[PDB]
């Protein structure tokens, strides 16, 4: 059975983000979710992706950052896999909305924990069709 995940937005105040993994459009099959992270359990090639939807009443061009990263035990430090940054993206003062999409292929090892992370947690909107984090084994 194909190793796969589609996690969707969830309400908490933590970095990294935490995700819904059962209800609605969520999927999780042969891969684990633990404290915000997807936990690889078969070394291999995977396509990994995340979208996050930002929005606010009053544009002030706070820098927006969107990161997929990896950790394990083997070394005591986050490794960033994909990242977007947005600056000067709304007209100051206006209601605004924009999304960041990341998707790419990675060779990953068993025991790798993958996480998504973000600059302005207040700016994030957590609707399930708008903000998500997934992968599948090739």
């Amino acid at each position: 059975l194909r190793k796969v995940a589609h996690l969707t937005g969830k309400s908490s105040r933590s970095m990294p983000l935490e995700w819904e993994h059962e209800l609605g459009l969520a999927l999780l099959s042969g891969v684990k979710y633990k404290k915000g992270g997807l936990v690889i359990n078969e070394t291999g090639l995977y396509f990994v992706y995340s979208k996050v939807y930002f929005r606010g009443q009053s544009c002030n061009n706070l820098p927006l950052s969107h990161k997929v990263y990896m950790r394990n035990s083997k070394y005591p430090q986050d490794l960033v896999m994909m990242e977007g940054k947005m600056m000067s993206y709304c007209t100051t003062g206006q209601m605004w909305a924009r999304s960041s999409y990341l998707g790419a292929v990675f060779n990953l090892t068993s025991a790798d924990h993958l996480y998504v992370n973000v600059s302005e947690l207040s700016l994030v909107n957590f609707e399930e069709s708008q903000t998500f984090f997934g992968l599948y084994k090739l």
Binding site: S11, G24, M95
Partner: protein, 153 residues
């Protein structure tokens, strides 16, 4: 009672099954020897119409920090939200109601669906305040009262 077609995945055989009602979903399709069996939507789920789903829909509307639940999640309907007191819906956001500045007063307050509505205080009346509720009041009957300032004695 509305119906639905169903090939048996056992005999390939064409049946007319009956749909589960609101609050339920199909739990076993009708076969030759029985009608459809419907089950209750579990928690956090719903079905709102006559349906042939194999699982109930998820109550996927959640309420913003500036919203309250208009309806709640129930086996028969999804949760629904609206702007909390002191806000109005616009372009999918919940905005604070306008205040009318001085020399203006409120001809209609802000509802959940609209802003405050203001007028220039008309002759004979005034408003001292930036208020989202205070309305133009007639001057006092004793310097000439403006629309911003009361008549002075």
């Amino acid at each position: 009672t509305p119906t639905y077609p169903w090939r048996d995945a056992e005999t390939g055989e064409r049946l007319v099954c009956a749909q589960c009602p609101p609050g339920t979903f199909v739990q076993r399709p009708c076969r030759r020897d029985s009608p459809t069996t419907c089950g209750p939507c579990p928690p956090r789920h719903y079905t709102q119409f006559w349906n042939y789903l194999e699982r109930c829909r998820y109550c996927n509307v959640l309420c913003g920090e500036r919203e309250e639940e208009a309806r709640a999640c129930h086996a028969t309907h999804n949760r629904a939200c609206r702007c909390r007191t002191g806000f109005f819906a616009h372009a999918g956001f919940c905005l604070e109601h306008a205040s009318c500045p001085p020399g203006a007063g409120v001809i209609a307050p802000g509802t959940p669906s609209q802003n405050t509505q203001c007028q220039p205080c008309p002759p004979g009346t005034f408003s001292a305040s930036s208020s989202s509720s205070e309305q133009c009041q007639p001057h006092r009957n004793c310097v000439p009262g403006s629309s911003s300032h009361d008549t002075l004695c």
